[PDB]
Amino acid sequence: SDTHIFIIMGASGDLAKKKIYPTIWWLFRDGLLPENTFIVGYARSRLTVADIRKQSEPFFKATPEEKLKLEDFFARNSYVAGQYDDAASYQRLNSHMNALHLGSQANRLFYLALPPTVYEAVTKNIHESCMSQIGWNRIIVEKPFGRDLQSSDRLSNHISSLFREDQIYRIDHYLGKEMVQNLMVLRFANRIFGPIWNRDNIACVILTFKEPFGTEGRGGYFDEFGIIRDVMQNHLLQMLCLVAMEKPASTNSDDVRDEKVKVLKCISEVQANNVVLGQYVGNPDGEGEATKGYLDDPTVPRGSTTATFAAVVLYVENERWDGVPFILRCGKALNERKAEVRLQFHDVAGDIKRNELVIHVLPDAYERLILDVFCGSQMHFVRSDELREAWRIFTPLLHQIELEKPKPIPYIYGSRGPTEADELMKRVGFQ
Amino acid sequence: SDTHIFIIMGASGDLAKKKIYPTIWWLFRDGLLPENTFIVGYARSRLTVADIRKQSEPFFKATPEEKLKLEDFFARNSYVAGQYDDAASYQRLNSHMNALHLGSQANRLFYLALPPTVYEAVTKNIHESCMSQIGWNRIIVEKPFGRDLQSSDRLSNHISSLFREDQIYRIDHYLGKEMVQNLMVLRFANRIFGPIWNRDNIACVILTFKEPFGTEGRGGYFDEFGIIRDVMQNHLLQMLCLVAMEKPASTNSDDVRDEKVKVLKCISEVQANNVVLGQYVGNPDGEGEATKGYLDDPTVPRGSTTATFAAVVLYVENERWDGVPFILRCGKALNERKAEVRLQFHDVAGDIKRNELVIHVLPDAYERLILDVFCGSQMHFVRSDELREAWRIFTPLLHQIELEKPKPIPYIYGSRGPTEADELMKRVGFQ
Lengths: 431, 431
Ligand SMILES: NC(=O)c1ccc[n+]([C@@H]2O[C@H](COP(=O)([O-])OP(=O)(O)OC[C@H]3O[C@@H](n4cnc5c(N)ncnc54)[C@H](OP(=O)(O)O)[C@@H]3O)[C@@H](O)[C@H]2O)c1
Ligand SMILES: NC(=O)c1ccc[n+]([C@@H]2O[C@H](COP(=O)([O-])OP(=O)(O)OC[C@H]3O[C@@H](n4cnc5c(N)ncnc54)[C@H](OP(=O)(O)O)[C@@H]3O)[C@@H](O)[C@H]2O)c1
Description:
Distance between the termini of chain A: 56 Å
Bound molecules: NADP nicotinamide-adenine-dinucleotide phosphate
Largest interface: A-B, 17 and 17 residues
Strand order of the largest sheet of chain A: 12-11-7-10-9-8-13
Strand content of chain A: 15-25%
Number of helices of chain A: 13
Oligomer: homodimer
Structural class of chain A: alpha/beta
Number of strands of chain A: 13
């Protein structure tokens, strides 16, 4: 219909204060949210809308000329305090939403801006209390979607034991503002160069994610996950799918996601001989944060073998791609800020250097993602089976890394990474 | 066999002194010429090898460590003086070549480093005097290959009335050192993206040749030809062919040139409504040669309407390409030194900006060209029918330009050119 209720489960938190509230404010300001939209925060800390405004408006980039729409925005805001497993608190939340103007009939969008540890409880109570009877119900869940196949399956089975898949929105938006554009142009490239992309023309494909900055005083959070879970398993794998997929049945989100899952179901589990791990150390001659290494970060626990750079070779195993190596190379604190997809060709030149086709890169990625959840297009959101296949591919390697704790290869801040990664590339065929 | 005689008809001249002798010296120095190679200059001016050495070795980049191979090179050099229509002088040349070590059996390569005005006479006498009886005979003819369809046909029929087509080498090497590489990568791109390049995926193709420098005190020679004859009619048209051509029967020079001619035979004669002409004027705020315009060049005759920039729309007319506009945009004194081929796609994006595939760019072009004439690969040399078709396409427009003398559009030194050219691009569909 026309009435929407934006619930922010965990509004007192960092993501809600620094990102969620500013982005929904920007969408409302630019007239992109539906006209009859309400925003409701929910957490345990006893707050008022004035407190959330006080702590969040610094991030709003509020100018003196848009203060009227800002007052309207905060007039459409409310806050309800309660526990995350207290049935009475969810009853109070449900009644408060039912009290809003034509709130009964309204579509409800729940942003689970909460540590995943509590998701279980929340997804239960929301199911039995706060769901809508008429309007649709959509849940936005956040990283981490587990850390291995077992945890991710238990969490995904719990969530997909209460809400249908067309109600679950797994959002990933921390790798830049051009992520959605990355995936869009890669899908367009697959639709265009479909007939050319075979094992006959291509000898090797690469997917690169370089960032020239380190952890920057926040390596503590990165340490618990690693560069494989942060970049490769979710993003680089999704665009590998987008590259290697067949022509979808249509332009429905579900058909192209079916093709992505069909691609994932052909990638066998990666093993350590096809993997090079690296950790960045301080540059002695550079200046600034380049002088500090990974272990020199105050937040990083000492003795951490966590890889901040990974080069991994995968193989799609069907008739279209066989023996064609997909080299996923990503790493923090490198030489450039580059996200590219290069496909090297079988040369045939008769002559009496290898050629490659390269793919580089109004609303930002996160803004477009929220607006997509509003429209209901699950295009840029990973599905349950897609996530399960990705975790299946990368979880034996990850279990080995956790058990044996292999020391990563040291590479210098600003370098391209270990030379052993380039050796691994040479092994399967490259430049 | 193993013995080669490099005749330089017109060795006293500018091209021979500044380019031909240095490049054959570089080939001999790098061991690329056949071991039993002799070089023979021929002109009317009474010279000795010492004189040619005196006037040409400045351009040799001679270092003190290669002086021995340089002495050997000039030992393999000789010079014969005589007129260009004197039968006795050609008899003396033929006898002198027959006197060289096993010169009778030797392959003979004639470089017609002469004004085309005399080619006729030369090609006659060489035919009846200096050709070899055993070894092959190959002629290198130079620009201009006529200035319109009639002159080019009379010259080409005269030359192809004495030497078979596998003996005629029309060389064009003045547009940079990467021309051969341009054509090679474009042929590879056609062989790869063959199935994609249809009227169904592509809405517009462009071929760009920008140069940031003006005429530089030598606009007098450029005035007699124009930017259409200098860049478009020969080079941009050849790479248009390379883009739009079908899959050749093989990798023989003649099969791919057959495909290029088949492409040319489908381009009807261009008319002035699809053409934008421009002339560059001095930049008032820039410095250096940018302060001087085209007419401010001392060599340029005043009142010259000669276009130094051209934007021309052509159309291949078959089933693979129909209504697909090929926009050939070239010009001196522009913003960049760019040579690109961009193909814009029919977007289909459903959504609740147009994409394009872009193609940019050991021996230099001219060096590789001479070495090709030695090997005998007529790949990067225009054929008689190819040249005739190009002249047919561009000669009615050129005749109109000569008759009516239309004033070109003034554009500033360093600019991208006339805005009317971009209007013409918009008319048929672009960005
Ligand atoms: N790159 C990434 O993977 C990435 C980056 C940023 C955020 N995230 C995800 O985004 C979500 C938002 O987290 P955040 O970083 O913005 O802030 P947060 O402090 O983790 O959580 C926000 C709210 O969660 C509640 N909370 C926190 N720990 C809790 C616990 N142990 N038990 C019960 N309630 C608890 C608190 O609400 P009250 O005390 O007011 O009740 C807090 O204000 C998380 O799930 C996080 O994983 C992921
Ligand atoms: N971008 C271009 O299109 C371009 C650029 C450079 C060169 N070229 C071509 O390259 C060729 C070489 O010419 P060049 O510029 O290097 O020098 P050139 O001075 O034009 O010719 C070299 C020799 O030609 C003879 N010659 C010149 N004019 C003559 C005439 N009217 N009658 C008889 N003999 C004559 C002279 O030999 P002697 O007096 O010793 O007998 C002279 O030393 C030309 O055909 C020119 O078109 C084209």
